Design a binder for this molecule. Sequence first.
Ligand code: HEM
Ligand code: HEM
Lengths: 381, 393
Amino acid sequence: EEINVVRAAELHRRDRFDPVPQLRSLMAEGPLTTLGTGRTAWLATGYDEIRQVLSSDDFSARLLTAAGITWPGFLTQYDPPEHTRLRRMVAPAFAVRRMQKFQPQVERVVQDSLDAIEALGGPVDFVPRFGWSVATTATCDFLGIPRDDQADLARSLHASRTERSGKRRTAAGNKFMTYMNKMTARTRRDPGDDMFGVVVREYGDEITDAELTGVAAFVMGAGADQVARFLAAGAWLMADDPEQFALLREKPDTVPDWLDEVIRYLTTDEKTHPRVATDDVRIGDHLIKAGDTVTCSLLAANRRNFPRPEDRFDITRVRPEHLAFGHGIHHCLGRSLAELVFRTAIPALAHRFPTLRLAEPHREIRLGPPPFDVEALLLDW
Amino acid sequence: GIDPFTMFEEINVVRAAELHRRDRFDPVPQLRSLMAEGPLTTLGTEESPGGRTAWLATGYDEIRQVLSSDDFSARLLYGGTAAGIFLTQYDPPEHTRLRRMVAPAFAVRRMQKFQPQVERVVQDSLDAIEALGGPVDFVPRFGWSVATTATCDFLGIPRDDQADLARSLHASRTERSGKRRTAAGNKFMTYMNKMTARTRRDPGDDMFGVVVREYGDEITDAELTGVAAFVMGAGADQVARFLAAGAWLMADDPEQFALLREKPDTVPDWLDEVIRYLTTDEKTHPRVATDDVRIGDHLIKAGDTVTCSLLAANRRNFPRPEDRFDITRVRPEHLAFGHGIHHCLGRSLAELVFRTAIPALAHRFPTLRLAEPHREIRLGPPPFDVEALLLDW
Ligand code: HEM
Ligand code: HEM
């Protein structure tokens, strides 16, 4: 049953922004297909069926010991009621009011990230200078990491995930986590105006150091990876189809749902973590036996009408429907922060470089392994 | 979010734990298969240039090589994990410096002196079981009763205090509520801080007084407290789980333990065989490679991790006849207490408790049996955790 998680990864590659032919074949086969098999690994590609799976109380997101021991603060490895307690304690850091009040700082992050790019001059790689820069600075600011330490903290996170020397990965992972631990200690003594502080002032000794460090490490990792990769993919979409984003730039009021369409089209997290069934559960016409796993294809759901015309990127589309942030109890806790950064950074780029385009538009943009990972994006203006 | 499969240390801890579940007393088929493959196999690899590999060592000699090598670190793994937040987290020189100061408390002469007290603890626990009447759960009534009392006596906690103090320590590590964790932790700490202050005024006969006499200045209060908490928490857990699994083995194979009770001098190494067969701590903490090392027919790169299967080493000939429990086996070999600089500090205490309590049980209840012979015994997550053991006699 473990090879079936490798198999899922293969189906979520991309032909530029499009899903690959292998996935399309499964999509047209039906809403729910077998990946492998008396236990069965299923892929859910139907919009309705995915929602049924992700919102059912007869599935667990657990791999298998209590989540808190090996995965403290890694929410998508908790089941209720432990999941419910921990998510309740961190959720107020992501409430609408705190997100609105964060918006001015996120605006400055994008403006300064754009001030650096213009000074450097075209052409220039937007993967590090726009994607990575905005994402890590915004996420560090949200956590209250002092500005003087962010560059080195962000460098150690990146090195821990990508370094070509395994030895240097270990050292960087240790550097990163020690810093997150020290942040937890400073909050416990003197809670500030940030995620750490908000959690500790509301709950205090109810949340443990392991939980708090765990959640903070997760938010840093999610913020740095998810937001950076999305912003890189957004800049590429801007370069590829600039007339649609000129409409955003000049007449944003006529396209109030624009961000949902970009999210739908790009789908930079293509699939959810496998869910294991705990009762026999009818899902559509299909029977999922207790012990089966179901992986949900968020790409399949959001791009369900590919390759027909209506699936093509249309920024004026009325109320775009997507499941890009999942569904049910594990739906993305960070959605409001991610969306704030995208709402701010994407139009800030359009206003700043209306004449944005690919430097070297002859050659293909190289993509890494999924999830959707633009490795370099050389743009001029 | 974050894909849990990209969490290198955590995902491979999980995979290693799954491999060290048990089918009654035996290794599961999945570990058996890896054992047959060779002395070292992969748990998993990060899929990128520079990606690290998590390895499982199952070969006896290869495990001794890994664990005696200076090119592996215990500290560097848990420092890259949110899960990693006493002695096993240290490398030399910190490891050496702390371990030398506490080692005198676990010396041979010290265990000889404690033996009469351990005999009394066993007899008291067995009297209480007898007074309850069958069927009795041997997990709380034999395993934990003996483990808690013997470990607290070793620390010199007065009998009146032991129940409350052990409860406090367990609360602080256990509860979901983090408020009750801090309250219980502070109750434990305030007691130990007084005990430390008392010891430093006049060193006594227990663990604290021995240490403070030989190394009083050079060891801190926090270090003393930390060692006590390990002995009372994790140490006691290890001992309780072993005694519960021992009692199960005795009920399961009464004829071999009848040999222990009637002709104990014919089976001088009996305890080494019981320990080998049961292997109630199935694996070591994962170590990070700090240099490249060739082991088996593989190259472990610096930054790769290795987890050693003590179960695999101890049960290396499973399922052949020679691996079966045989209390008369001459000089049984095992690595149940690890190897190299991190080898069990409490081995001699653990063995004294087992050497005393197991014969005591065999003599008291020669008719010991499962209460519900056909009902399966439920095992918790690794390490070897008998959840309930209803015995009668
Ligand atoms: C600062 C940015 C982000 C943070 C802090 C964040 C945080 C989280 C957290 C904590 C969860 C787990 C919630 C739970 O289990 O209860 C989660 C789940 C999820 N996030 Fe995010 N996230 C971020 C950005 C993104 C982005 C940009 C996407 C997609 C484009 C995304 C997609 C998801 C999905 C699909 C899940 C559900 C996973 C599943 O059910 O298996 N996240 N996120
Ligand atoms: C009163 C009982 C016990 C105490 C106080 C105790 C104490 C300790 C301590 C302090 C260490 C760390 C040593 C270091 O890093 O230098 C250790 C390691 C170890 N102990 Fe124990 N122990 C006890 C019982 C047991 C039992 C019953 C077993 C097995 C059946 C066991 C197996 C181990 C193993 C395998 C290690 C090494 C782990 C590794 O290298 O990663 N111990 N013990």
